[PDB]
Amino acid sequence: DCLGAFRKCIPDNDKCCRPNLVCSRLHRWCKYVF
């Protein structure tokens, strides 16, 4: 199941649905690469 969808992320332990969603550090949340 994909974790993320604008959920705030911890860059040192990024848990989002990779490789589709990654912690966008500047945005502060798990955003989609798409």
Coordinates of N, CA, C and O in Angstrom, one line a residue:
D1 N 0.9 -1.2 0.0 CA 0.0 0.0 0.0 C 0.9 1.2 0.0 O 1.9 1.2 0.7
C2 N 0.5 2.2 -0.8 CA 1.4 3.3 -0.9 C 1.2 4.4 0.2 O 0.2 4.9 0.4
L3 N 2.3 4.5 0.9 CA 2.4 5.5 2.0 C 2.7 6.8 1.3 O 3.5 6.9 0.3
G4 N 2.2 7.9 1.8 CA 2.5 9.2 1.2 C 1.3 10.0 1.1 O 0.6 10.3 2.1
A5 N 1.0 10.5 -0.1 CA -0.1 11.4 -0.5 C 0.0 12.6 0.4 O -0.9 12.8 1.3
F6 N 1.1 13.4 0.3 CA 1.2 14.7 1.0 C 1.4 14.5 2.5 O 1.2 15.5 3.3
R7 N 1.7 13.3 3.0 CA 2.0 13.1 4.4 C 3.4 13.6 4.7 O 4.3 13.3 3.8
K8 N 3.6 14.3 5.7 CA 5.0 14.8 6.1 C 6.0 13.8 6.3 O 5.7 12.7 7.0
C9 N 7.1 14.0 5.8 CA 8.2 13.0 5.7 C 9.4 13.3 6.5 O 9.8 14.5 6.6
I10 N 10.1 12.3 7.0 CA 11.4 12.5 7.7 C 12.5 12.1 6.7 O 12.6 10.9 6.3
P11 N 13.3 13.0 6.2 CA 14.3 12.8 5.2 C 15.3 11.7 5.6 O 15.9 11.0 4.7
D12 N 15.6 11.6 6.9 CA 16.6 10.6 7.4 C 16.1 9.2 7.4 O 16.9 8.3 7.6
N13 N 14.8 9.0 7.2 CA 14.2 7.7 7.2 C 12.9 7.8 6.4 O 11.8 7.9 6.9
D14 N 13.1 8.0 5.1 CA 12.0 8.3 4.2 C 11.2 7.0 4.0 O 11.7 6.0 3.4
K15 N 10.0 7.0 4.4 CA 9.0 6.0 4.2 C 7.8 6.5 3.4 O 6.8 7.0 4.0
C16 N 7.9 6.4 2.1 CA 6.8 6.8 1.3 C 6.7 5.6 0.3 O 7.6 4.7 0.4
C17 N 5.8 5.6 -0.7 CA 5.7 4.5 -1.6 C 6.8 4.7 -2.7 O 6.4 5.3 -3.8
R18 N 8.0 4.3 -2.5 CA 9.0 4.5 -3.5 C 8.9 3.4 -4.6 O 8.4 2.3 -4.3
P19 N 9.3 3.7 -5.8 CA 9.9 4.9 -6.2 C 8.9 6.0 -6.7 O 9.3 7.0 -7.4
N20 N 7.6 5.8 -6.5 CA 6.6 6.6 -6.9 C 6.4 7.9 -6.1 O 6.2 9.0 -6.6
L21 N 6.6 7.7 -4.8 CA 6.5 8.8 -3.9 C 7.8 8.9 -3.1 O 8.2 7.8 -2.6
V22 N 8.3 10.0 -2.9 CA 9.6 10.2 -2.2 C 9.4 11.5 -1.3 O 8.6 12.4 -1.7
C23 N 10.0 11.5 -0.2 CA 10.0 12.7 0.7 C 10.6 13.9 -0.1 O 11.8 13.9 -0.4
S24 N 9.7 14.8 -0.4 CA 10.2 16.0 -0.9 C 10.5 17.0 0.2 O 9.6 17.5 0.8
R25 N 11.8 17.1 0.4 CA 12.3 17.8 1.6 C 11.9 19.3 1.6 O 11.5 19.8 2.6
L26 N 11.9 19.9 0.4 CA 11.5 21.3 0.3 C 10.0 21.5 0.5 O 9.5 22.5 1.1
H27 N 9.2 20.5 0.1 CA 7.8 20.6 0.3 C 7.4 20.1 1.6 O 6.4 20.5 2.2
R28 N 8.2 19.2 2.2 CA 8.1 18.7 3.6 C 7.2 17.4 3.6 O 6.9 16.9 4.7
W29 N 6.8 16.9 2.5 CA 5.9 15.8 2.4 C 6.3 14.8 1.3 O 7.1 15.1 0.4
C30 N 5.7 13.6 1.4 CA 5.8 12.6 0.4 C 5.0 13.0 -0.8 O 3.8 13.0 -0.7
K31 N 5.7 13.3 -1.8 CA 5.0 13.7 -3.0 C 5.3 12.7 -4.1 O 6.3 11.9 -3.9
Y32 N 4.6 12.7 -5.1 CA 4.7 11.8 -6.2 C 5.8 12.3 -7.1 O 6.0 13.5 -7.2
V33 N 6.6 11.4 -7.7 CA 7.6 11.8 -8.6 C 7.0 12.2 -9.9 O 7.5 13.0 -10.7
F34 N 5.7 11.8 -10.1 CA 4.9 12.2 -11.2 C 4.1 13.3 -10.7 O 4.5 14.5 -10.8

